[PDB]
Coordinates of C-alpha atoms and ligand atoms in Angstrom, one line a residue:
X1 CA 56.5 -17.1 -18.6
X2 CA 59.7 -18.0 -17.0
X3 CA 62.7 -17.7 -18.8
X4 CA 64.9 -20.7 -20.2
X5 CA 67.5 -20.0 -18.1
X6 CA 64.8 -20.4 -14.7
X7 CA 63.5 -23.5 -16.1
X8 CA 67.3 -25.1 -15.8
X9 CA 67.4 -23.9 -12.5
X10 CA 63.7 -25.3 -11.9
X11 CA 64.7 -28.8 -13.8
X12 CA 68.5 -29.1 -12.3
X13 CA 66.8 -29.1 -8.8
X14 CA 63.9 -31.5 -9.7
X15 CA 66.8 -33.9 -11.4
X16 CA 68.3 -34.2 -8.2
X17 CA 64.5 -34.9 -6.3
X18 CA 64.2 -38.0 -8.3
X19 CA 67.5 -39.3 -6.4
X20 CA 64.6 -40.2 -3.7
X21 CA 61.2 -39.4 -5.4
X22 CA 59.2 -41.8 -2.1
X23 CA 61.2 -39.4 0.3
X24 CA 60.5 -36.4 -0.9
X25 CA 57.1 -37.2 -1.1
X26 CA 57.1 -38.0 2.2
X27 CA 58.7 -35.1 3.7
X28 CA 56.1 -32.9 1.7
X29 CA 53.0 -34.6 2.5
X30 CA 53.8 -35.0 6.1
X31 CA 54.9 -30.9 6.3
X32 CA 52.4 -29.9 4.2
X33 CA 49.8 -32.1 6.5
X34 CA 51.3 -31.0 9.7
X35 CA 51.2 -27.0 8.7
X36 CA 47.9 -26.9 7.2
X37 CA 45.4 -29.5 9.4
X38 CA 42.6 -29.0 7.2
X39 CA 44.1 -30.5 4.1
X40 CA 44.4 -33.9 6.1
X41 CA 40.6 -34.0 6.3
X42 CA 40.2 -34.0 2.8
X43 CA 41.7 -37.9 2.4
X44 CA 39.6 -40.4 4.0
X45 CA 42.9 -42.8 3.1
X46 CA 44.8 -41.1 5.3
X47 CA 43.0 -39.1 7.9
X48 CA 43.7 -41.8 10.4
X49 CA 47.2 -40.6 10.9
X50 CA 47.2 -38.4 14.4
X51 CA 51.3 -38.2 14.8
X52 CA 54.1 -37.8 12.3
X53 CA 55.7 -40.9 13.5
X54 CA 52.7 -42.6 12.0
X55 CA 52.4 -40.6 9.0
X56 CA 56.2 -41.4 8.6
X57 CA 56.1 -45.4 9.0
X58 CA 52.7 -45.1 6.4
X59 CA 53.6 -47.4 3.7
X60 CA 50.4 -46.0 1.7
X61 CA 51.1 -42.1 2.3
X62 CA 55.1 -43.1 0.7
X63 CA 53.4 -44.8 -2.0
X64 CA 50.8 -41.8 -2.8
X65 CA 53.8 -39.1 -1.9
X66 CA 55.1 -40.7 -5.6
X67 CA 52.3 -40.4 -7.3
X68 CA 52.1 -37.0 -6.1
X69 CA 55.3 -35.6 -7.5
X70 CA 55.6 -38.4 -10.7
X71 CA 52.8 -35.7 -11.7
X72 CA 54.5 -32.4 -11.0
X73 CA 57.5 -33.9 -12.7
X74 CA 55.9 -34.6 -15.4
X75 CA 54.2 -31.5 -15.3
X76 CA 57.8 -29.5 -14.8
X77 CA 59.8 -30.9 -17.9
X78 CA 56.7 -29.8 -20.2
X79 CA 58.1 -26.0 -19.6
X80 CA 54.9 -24.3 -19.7
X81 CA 53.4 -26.7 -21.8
X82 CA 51.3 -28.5 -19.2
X83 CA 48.0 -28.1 -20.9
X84 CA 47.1 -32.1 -21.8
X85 CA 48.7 -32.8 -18.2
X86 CA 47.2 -30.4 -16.1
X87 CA 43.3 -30.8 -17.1
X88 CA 42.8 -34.1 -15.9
X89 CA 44.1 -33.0 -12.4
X90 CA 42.3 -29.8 -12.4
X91 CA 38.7 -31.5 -12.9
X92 CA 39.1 -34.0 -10.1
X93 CA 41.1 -31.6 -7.9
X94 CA 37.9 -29.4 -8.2
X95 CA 35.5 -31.0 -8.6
X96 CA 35.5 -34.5 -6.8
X97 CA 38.4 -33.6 -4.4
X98 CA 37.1 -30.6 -3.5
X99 CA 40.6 -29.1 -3.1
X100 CA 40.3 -25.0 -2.8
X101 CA 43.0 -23.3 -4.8
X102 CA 44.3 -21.4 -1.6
X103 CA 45.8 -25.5 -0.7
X104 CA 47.8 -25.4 -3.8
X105 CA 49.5 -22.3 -2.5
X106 CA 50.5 -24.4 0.6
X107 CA 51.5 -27.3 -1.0
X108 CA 54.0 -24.8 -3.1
X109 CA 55.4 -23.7 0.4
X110 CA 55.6 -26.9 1.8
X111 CA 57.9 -28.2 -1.9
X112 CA 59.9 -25.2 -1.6
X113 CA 60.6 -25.7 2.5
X114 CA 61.6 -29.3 1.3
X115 CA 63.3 -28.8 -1.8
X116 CA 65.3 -26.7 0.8
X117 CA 66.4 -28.7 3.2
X118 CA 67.6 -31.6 0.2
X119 CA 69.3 -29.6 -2.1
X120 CA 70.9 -26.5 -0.5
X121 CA 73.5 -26.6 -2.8
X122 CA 71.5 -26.8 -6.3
X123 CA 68.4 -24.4 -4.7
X124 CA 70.0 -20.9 -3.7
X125 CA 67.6 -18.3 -3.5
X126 CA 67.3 -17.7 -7.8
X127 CA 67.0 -21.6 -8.2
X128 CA 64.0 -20.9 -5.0
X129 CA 63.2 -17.6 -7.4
X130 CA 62.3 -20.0 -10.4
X131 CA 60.2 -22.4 -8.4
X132 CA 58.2 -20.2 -6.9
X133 CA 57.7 -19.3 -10.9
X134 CA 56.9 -22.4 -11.8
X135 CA 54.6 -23.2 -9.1
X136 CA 52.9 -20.1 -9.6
X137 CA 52.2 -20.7 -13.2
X138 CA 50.7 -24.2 -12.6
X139 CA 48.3 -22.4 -9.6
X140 CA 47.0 -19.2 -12.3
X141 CA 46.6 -22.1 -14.9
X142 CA 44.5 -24.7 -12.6
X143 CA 43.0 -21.8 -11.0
X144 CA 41.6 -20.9 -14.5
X145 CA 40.1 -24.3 -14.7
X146 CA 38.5 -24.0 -11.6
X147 CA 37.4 -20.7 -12.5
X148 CA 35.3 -22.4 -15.9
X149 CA 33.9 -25.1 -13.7
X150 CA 32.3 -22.8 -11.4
X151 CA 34.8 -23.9 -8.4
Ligands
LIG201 C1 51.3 -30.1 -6.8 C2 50.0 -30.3 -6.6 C3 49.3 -31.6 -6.8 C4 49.5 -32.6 -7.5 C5 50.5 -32.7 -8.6 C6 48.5 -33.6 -7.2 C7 48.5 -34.8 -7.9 C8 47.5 -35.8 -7.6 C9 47.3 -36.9 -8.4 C10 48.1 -37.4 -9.6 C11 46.2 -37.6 -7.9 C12 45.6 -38.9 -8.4 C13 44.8 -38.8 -9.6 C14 43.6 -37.9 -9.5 O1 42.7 -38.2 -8.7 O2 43.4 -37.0 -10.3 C15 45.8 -36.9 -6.8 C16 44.8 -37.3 -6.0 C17 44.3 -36.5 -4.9 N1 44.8 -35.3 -4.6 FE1 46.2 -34.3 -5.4 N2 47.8 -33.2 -6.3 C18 48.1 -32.0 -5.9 C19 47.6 -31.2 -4.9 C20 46.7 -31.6 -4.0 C21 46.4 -31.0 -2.8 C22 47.0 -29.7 -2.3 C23 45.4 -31.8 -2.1 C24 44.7 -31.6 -0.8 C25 45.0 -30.7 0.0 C26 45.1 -32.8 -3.0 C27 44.3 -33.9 -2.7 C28 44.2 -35.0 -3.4 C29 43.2 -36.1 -3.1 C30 42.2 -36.1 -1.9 C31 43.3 -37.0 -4.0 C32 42.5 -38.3 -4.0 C33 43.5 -39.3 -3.3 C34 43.1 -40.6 -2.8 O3 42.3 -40.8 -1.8 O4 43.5 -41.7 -3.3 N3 45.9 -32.7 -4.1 N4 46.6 -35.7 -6.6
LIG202 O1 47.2 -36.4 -3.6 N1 47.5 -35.3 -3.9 C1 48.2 -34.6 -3.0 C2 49.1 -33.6 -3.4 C3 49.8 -32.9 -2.5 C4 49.7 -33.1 -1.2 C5 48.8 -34.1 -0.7 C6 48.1 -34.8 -1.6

């Protein structure tokens, strides 16, 4: 559980991602994408993308880059209390996404890396402490739900 004083860290940081929620998103799929090939090949929509110009200049990768982290958001402010939230996404994630759980641990790296190069000011290393918390909560509690599902 993280402490009350790690979730403001956690929160004050995410506050300041919704200045530019379609950026973000972009800057995280596309690093994400670019570190870890594989995970491209999971998305039919997108697997057509071959540079990060063209990733960048995707209108439709932006557009799913906010429904992306509308969800962690949403999932964030809940402070632990992402049950209702977090089933939904762990069912199709496992089972008709076929997303291992090892890709949530890259898509953590790939927020944090961002998060990073946004926010220096408002993501020292205890702010990047608390997110790696936070993260790491939402992997054990999917990873639990996969673990039920036989995934
Ligand atoms: C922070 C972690 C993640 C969040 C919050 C998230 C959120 C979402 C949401 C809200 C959807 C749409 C609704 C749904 O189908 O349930 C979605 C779809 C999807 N997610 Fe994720 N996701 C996460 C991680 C990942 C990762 C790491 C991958 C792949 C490596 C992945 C692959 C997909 C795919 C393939 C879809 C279907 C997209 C489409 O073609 O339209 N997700 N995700
Ligand atoms: O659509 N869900 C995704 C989540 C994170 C990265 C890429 C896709």
């Amino acid at each position: 559980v993280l402490s009350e004083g790690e979730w403001q860290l956690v929160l004050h940081v995410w506050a300041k991602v919704e200045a530019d929620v379609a950026g973000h998103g972009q800057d995280i799929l596309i690093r994400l994408f670019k570190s870890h090939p594989e995970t491209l090949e999971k998305f039919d929509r997108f697997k057509h993308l071959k540079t990060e110009a063209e990733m960048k200049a995707s209108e439709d990768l932006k557009k799913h880059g906010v429904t992306v982290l509308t969800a962690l958001g949403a999932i964030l402010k809940k402070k632990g209390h992402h049950e209702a939230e977090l089933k939904p996404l762990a069912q199709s994630h496992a089972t008709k996404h076929k997303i291992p759980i090892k890709y949530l641990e890259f898509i953590s790296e790939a927020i944090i890396h961002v998060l990073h190069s946004r926010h220096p000011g408002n993501f020292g290393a205890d702010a990047q402490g608390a997110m790696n918390k936070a993260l790491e909560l939402f992997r054990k509690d999917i990873a639990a739900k996969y673990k039920e599902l036989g995934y």
